[PDB]
Amino acid sequence: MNAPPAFESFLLFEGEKKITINKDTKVPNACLFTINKEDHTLGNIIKSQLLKDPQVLFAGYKVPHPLEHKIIIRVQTTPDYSPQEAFTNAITDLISELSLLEERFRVAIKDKQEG
Amino acid sequence: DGLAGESVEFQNLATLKPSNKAFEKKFRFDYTNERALRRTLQEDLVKDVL
Amino acid sequence: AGILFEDIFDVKDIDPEGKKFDRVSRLHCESESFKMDLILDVNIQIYPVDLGDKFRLVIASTLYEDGTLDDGEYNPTDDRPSRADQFEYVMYGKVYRIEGDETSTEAATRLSAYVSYGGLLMRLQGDANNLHGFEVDSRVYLLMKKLAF
Amino acid sequence: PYANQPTVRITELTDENVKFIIENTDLAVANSIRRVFIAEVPIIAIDWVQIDANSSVLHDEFIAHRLGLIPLTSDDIVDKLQYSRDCTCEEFCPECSVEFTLDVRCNEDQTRHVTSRDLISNSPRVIPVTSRQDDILIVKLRKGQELRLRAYAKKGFGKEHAKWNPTAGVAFEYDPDNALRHTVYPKPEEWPKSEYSELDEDESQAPYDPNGKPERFYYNVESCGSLRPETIVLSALSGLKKKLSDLQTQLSHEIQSD
Amino acid sequence: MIIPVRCFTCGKIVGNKWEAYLGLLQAEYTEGDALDALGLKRYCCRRMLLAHVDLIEKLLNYAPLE
Ligand SMILES: [Zn+2]
Numbered sequence: 001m002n003a004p005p006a007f008e009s010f011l012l013f014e015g016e017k018k019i020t021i022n023k024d025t026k027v028p029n030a031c032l033f034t035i036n037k038e039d040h041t042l043g044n045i046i047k048s049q050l051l052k053d054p055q056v057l058f059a060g061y062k063v064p065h066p067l068e069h070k071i072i073i074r075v076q077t078t079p080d081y082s083p084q085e086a087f088t089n090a091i092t093d094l095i096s097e098l099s100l101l102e103e104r105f106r107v108a109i110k111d112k113q114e115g
Numbered sequence: 116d117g118l119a120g121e122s123v124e125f126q127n128l129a130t131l132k133p134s135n136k137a138f139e140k141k142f143r144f145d146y147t148n149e150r151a152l153r154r155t156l157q158e159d160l161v162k163d164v165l
Numbered sequence: 166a167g168i169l170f171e172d173i174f175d176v177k178d179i180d181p182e183g184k185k186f187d188r189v190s191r192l193h194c195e196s197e198s199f200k201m202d203l204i205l206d207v208n209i210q211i212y213p214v215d216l217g218d219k220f221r222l223v224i225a226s227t228l229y230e231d232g233t234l235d236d237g238e239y240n241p242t243d244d245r246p247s248r249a250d251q252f253e254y255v256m257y258g259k260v261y262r263i264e265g266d267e268t269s270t271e272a273a274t275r276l277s278a279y280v281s282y283g284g285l286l287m288r289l290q291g292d293a294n295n296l297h298g299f300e301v302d303s304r305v306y307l308l309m310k311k312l313a314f
Numbered sequence: 315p316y317a318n319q320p321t322v323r324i325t326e327l328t329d330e331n332v333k334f335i336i337e338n339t340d341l342a343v344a345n346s347i348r349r350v351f352i353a354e355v356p357i358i359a360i361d362w363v364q365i366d367a368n369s370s371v372l373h374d375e376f377i378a379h380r381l382g383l384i385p386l387t388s389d390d391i392v393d394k395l396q397y398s399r400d401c402t403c404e405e406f407c408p409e410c411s412v413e414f415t416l417d418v419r420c421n422e423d424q425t426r427h428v429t430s431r432d433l434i435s436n437s438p439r440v441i442p443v444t445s446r447q448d449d450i451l452i453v454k455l456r457k458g459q460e461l462r463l464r465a466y467a468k469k470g471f472g473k474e475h476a477k478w479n480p481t482a483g484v485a486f487e488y489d490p491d492n493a494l495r496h497t498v499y500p501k502p503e504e505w506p507k508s509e510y511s512e513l514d515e516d517e518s519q520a521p522y523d524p525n526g527k528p529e530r531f532y533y534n535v536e537s538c539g540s541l542r543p544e545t546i547v548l549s550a551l552s553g554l555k556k557k558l559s560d561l562q563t564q565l566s567h568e569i570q571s572d
Numbered sequence: 573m574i575i576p577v578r579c580f581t582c583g584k585i586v587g588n589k590w591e592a593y594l595g596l597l598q599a600e601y602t603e604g605d606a607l608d609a610l611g612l613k614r615y616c617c618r619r620m621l622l623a624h625v626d627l628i629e630k631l632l633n634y635a636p637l638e
Pocket residue numbers: 401402403404405406407408409410411
């Protein structure tokens with residue numbers, strides 16, 4: 001009777017923020033990015049892209065509870081490199097790589113048809 | 116005894132079932148061999164215990 | 166300096182009670198000058214070793230030449246000189262037991278340093294003269310390099 | 315401190331499935347692209363059934379359940395229509411939905427086979443998979459029974475329900491020879507060789523490789539019939555790009571607000 | 573009772589194949605060849621034509637009128 005619907009996994013609720021930044025107090029230059037209504041699709045690629053950057057000292061996400069739709073990403077970089085710009089660069093260059101992959105796949109398909 | 120059953124742990128009794136010879140050489144603290152005292156205690160205690 | 170020990174070894178026997186695990190094995194090595202035993206456990210998978218090979222094992226308390234006694238933490242972003250640049254296999258552990266042939270009157274002549282690198286053990290058994298730099302509850306490194314000879 | 319330049323090579327292009335290879339990319343990107351292939355792919359499907367007279371033997375909900383699983387071709391319609399939740403009108407508008415109708419009544423003596431062909435759609439291009447192989451049997455009617463109803467179709471993705479799952483099964487596989495030791499075979503000789511394995515028949519598995527990253531990820535996206543496989547790949551990549559862009563915009567707004 | 577529309581595990585449409593499966597078994601073909609003649613490679617989708625019971629016929633035997 002109380003099974004949740006299907007739209008509460010991706011659709012935002014009124015008042016609920018898509019992303020929230022929270023600075024950590026245990027170590028300097030460390031913030032936990034909390035993402036709402038998402039899953040491993042949008043966190044694993046960002047985790048790996050952050051891992052590629054050498055200036056990022058720490059990078060990793062988790063799922064507080066599988067039924068609940070939220071992921072926390074913790075990022076810790078060098079003191080001369082804020083984690084906000086690290087996250088922004090990771091997202092931007094991941095977008096660029098995905099677009100390039102799209103373009104290459106499309107040209108490969110169009111060449112494969114009768115060619 | 117008057118103790119709760121939660122804060123009790125299994126232990127062993129060192130002075131139970133020795134041999135008479137070993138019990139003497141483990142709980143007597145021989146105060147004659149000054150070399151052992153220098154090895155174990157410091158110089159400012161061997162003279163005091165002697 | 167911080168060189169707690171330095172000497173050439175050579176391997177004479179590998180897992181003599183039979184290989185138990187699949188990535189670690191016993192290295193019953195021997196010295197060449199100080200004549201001391203060695204029961205080092207290396208990752209045979211990533212760093213294969215065969216019998217007869219010689220290596221320069223150097224137990225050092227720190228990886229820096231100036232010896233600044235690092236606190237202990239992973240900081241890849243570091244441009245300072247590191248002694249590991251001339252070693253193909255470096256590990257980090259903490260010695261936990263220093264057994265020796267002590268008696269009630271005369272001091273020990275042979276000690277035995279037991280160090281555990283987070284699971285990989287080593288017994289550097291030998292005389293009690295060159296093991297003065299080993300104290301219980303202290304961080305140490307390995308810093309070995311196989312010799313081409 | 316930047317990403318990589320992946321390469322693509324199609325090995326088999328057909329109208330039912332595509333086998334392509336992605337090289338020089340991270341495992342996480344590959345797995346995410348797979349999961350987007352399965353879950354987050356826009357596609358049209360039946361999601362609102364109005365039953366007026368159902369005299370069949372099956373349940374009233376059974377008809378709707380079966381109708382929900384009937385694929386609908388959306389090669390150039392899914393990109394145009396908008397999600398019904400974000401619509402700015404009332405009732406299922408044709409601009410954001412597609413109407414269907416089914417009116418079959420077994421009059422003759424022989425039993426009827428109500429198939430997907432009976433779904434008369436208002437739009438020409440939004441039809442069940444019957445263009446160019448028999449049709450999806452809905453129910454069987456007998457003399458005296460009938461089934462009249464009309465349904466509307468909307469856009470959705472597999473994350474909401476399995477009706478919007480275009481791909482049948484994605485055969486994701488990387489590193490056919492067990493070179494990275496990501497799996498340890500107790501007896502390698504007892505296992506068969508992967509389809510894409512380049513090693514000879516003598517050696518069982520490739521030797522260990524310490525400094526080696528996973529590359530050359532293989533794909534076998536298999537379309538159910540609604541969307542074309544390459545169309546599925548393009549739509550999934552475009553959706554992932556849109557999600558990344560929205561996340562970047564939200565992060566930028568959050569940073570400026572602070 | 574009736575053939576499903578899609579395979580539970582995979583998702584491939586199998587609803588439009590029960591009649592064809594019966595016909596191919598009818599002519600001369602046997603099951604082991606009929607299944608791959610229809611185009612079912614994965615073993616997960618092959619249970620839909622082997623394990624399925626066709627109980628809709630008995631239900632249709634109870635015709636309401638005439
Ligand atoms: Zn509308």
